[PDB]
Ligand binder design. Structure first.
Ligand SMILES: CC(=O)N[C@@H](Cc1ccccc1Cl)C(=O)N1CCC[C@]12C=C[C@@H]1CC[C@@H](C(=O)N3CC[C@@H]4C=C[C@H]5[C@H](C)C[C@@H](C(=O)O)N5C(=O)[C@H]43)N1C2=O
Ligand SMILES: CC(=O)N[C@@H](Cc1ccccc1Cl)C(=O)N1CCC[C@]12C=C[C@@H]1CC[C@@H](C(=O)N3CC[C@@H]4C=C[C@H]5[C@H](C)C[C@@H](C(=O)O)N5C(=O)[C@H]43)N1C2=O
Ligand SMILES: CC(=O)N[C@@H](Cc1ccccc1Cl)C(=O)N1CCC[C@]12C=C[C@@H]1CC[C@@H](C(=O)N3CC[C@@H]4C=C[C@H]5[C@H](C)C[C@@H](C(=O)O)N5C(=O)[C@H]43)N1C2=O
Length: 113
C-alpha cells in the first residue's frame, strides 16, 4: 500500500519546465513560486519519482518518474535539471544546501535503480 512508498529526501525549490516552442523556462503548473519537492522510493518495485507541491497551496506541479539511467544535470550551484519525454524539468533551489542535499540523494537513487 501507500506505506511502502517512502520519502527519502525533500527540499525547497521552484519547479520550472522548458517551453520548447518559445525557448523559455516557465513555471511548472502555471505560477512561479517555491515548492516542497520530494524524492519518493517505491520499495516494492524499487522505483523512484519526484513529486513537488507548491508550498502556499499544495498544487502538484511535478510528478515525474526517475527511470534507470536518468541523467541529472547540475547546471549551476542552485539550478539543476533533467529530461522527461514530455518536457525538461528544472529546479531552482532555495539554497545551495537544498541543491546539494537533493542532488546527492538523486545520485544515490540512480545508483540503486
Ligand atoms: C507528504 C507525504 O508524502 N506524506 C506521507 C508521509 C508518509 C507517511 C507514512 C509512510 C510514508 C510516508 Cl511518505 C503521508 O502522510 N501519507 C499519508 C498516507 C499516504 C502517505 C504515505 C505514503 C505516500 C507516499 C506518497 C504520498 C502520496 O500519496 N503522494 C505524494 C503527493 C502525491 C500527490 C497527489 C496524489 C494524487 C491525487 C494521487 C497520487 C498520485 O500522485 O498518483 N497522489 C499521491 O501519490 C500523493 N503518500 C502519502 O501522502
Ligand atoms: C506523465 C507526465 O509527466 N504528465 C504530465 C502532463 C503531460 C501529459 C501529456 C503530455 C505532456 C504533459 Cl507535460 C503531468 O502530469 N504533469 C506535468 C507537470 C504537471 C503534471 C504533474 C502533476 C500534476 C497532477 C495534476 C496535473 C495537472 O496539473 N493538470 C491536469 C491538466 C490540468 C490542466 C491545466 C492546469 C491549469 C493551468 C492549472 C491547473 C488547474 O486546472 O487549476 N491545471 C491542472 O491541474 C492541469 N499534473 C500535471 O499535469
Ligand atoms: C543535452 C541536453 O539535454 N541538454 C540540456 C541540459 C541537460 C544536460 C544533461 C542532462 C540533462 C539536461 Cl536537461 C539543455 O541544454 N537544455 C534543456 C533545457 C534547455 C537547455 C537548452 C538550452 C539552454 C541554453 C541555456 C540553458 C539554460 O536554460 N540555462 C543555463 C543555466 C541557466 C540557469 C538558470 C535558469 C533560470 C532559472 C532561467 C534561465 C535564465 O537564466 O534566464 N535559466 C537558464 O537559462 C539556465 N539551456 C538548457 O539548459
Amino acid at each position: 500500500g501507500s506505506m511502502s512508498e517512502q520519502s527519502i529526501c525533500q527540499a525547497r525549490a521552484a519547479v520550472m519546465v522548458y517551453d520548447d516552442a518559445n525557448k523559455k523556462w516557465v513555471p511548472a503548473g502555471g505560477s512561479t513560486g517555491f515548492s516542497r519537492v520530494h524524492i519518493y522510493h517505491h520499495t516494492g518495485n524499487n522505483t523512484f519519482r519526484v513529486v513537488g507541491r507548491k508550498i502556499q497551496d499544495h498544487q502538484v506541479v511535478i510528478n515525474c518518474a526517475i527511470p534507470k539511467g536518468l541523467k541529472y544535470n547540475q547546471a549551476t550551484q542552485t539550478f539543476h535539471q533533467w529530461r522527461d519525454a514530455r518536457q525538461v524539468y528544472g529546479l531552482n533551489f532555495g539554497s545551495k544546501e537544498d541543491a546539494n542535499v537533493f542532488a546527492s540523494a538523486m545520485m544515490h537513487a540512480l545508483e540503486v535503480l
